[PDB]
Structure 1
């Protein structure tokens, strides 16, 4: 199964690093400082539809 892409910071079940899935068990942050997304451990909500 594959999820969709992210659109905000804090999501979880989506695609942060290129096309890799980073969600449950961790937290994802989008473009930090004009940079790309990053998978940081924490508490994030899945990606609704």
Structure 2
């Protein structure tokens, strides 16, 4: 999977302490202004995802449904 920066505190599997994924069983504590991020231990909720794209031309009707 590609791992990226944690946008909310509590978040689980994200790029928390530098470019280092904060694995499961860990919580990314978003440092406030000029304070450092701290992937502390605790259960925490993973980031969102299951993406990529927005304008896919119409494919032959039945394939899809």
Q: TM-score with structure 2 length normalisation?
A: 0.62
Question: Which structure's relative contact order is higher, taking Cα pairs within 8 Å and 6+ residues apart?
Answer: 1
CA RMSD of aligned residues (A): 3.7
Kindly indicate whether the alpha-carbon contact (under 8 Å) linking 1:4 and 1:14 is maintained by their aligned counterparts in 2: yes
Which of the pair is proportionally richer in strand? 2
Q: Moved runs in structure 1, 4+ residues, more than 3 A?
A: none
Kindly indicate whether the alpha-carbon contact (under 8 Å) linking 1:11 and 1:23 is maintained by their aligned counterparts in 2: no
Kindly indicate whether the alpha-carbon contact (under 8 Å) linking 2:6 and 2:28 is maintained by their aligned counterparts in 1: no
How far the C-alpha of 1:32 sits from its partner, in A, is 4.8
Extract unaligned runs of 5+ from structure 2: 49-64
Higher alpha-carbon Rg: 2
Residue of structure 2 equivalent to 1:41: 41
How far the C-alpha of 1:39 sits from its partner, in A, is 1.0
How far the C-alpha of 1:23 sits from its partner, in A, is 2.8
- Count of matched residue positions in the alignment of Structure 1 and Structure 2: 49
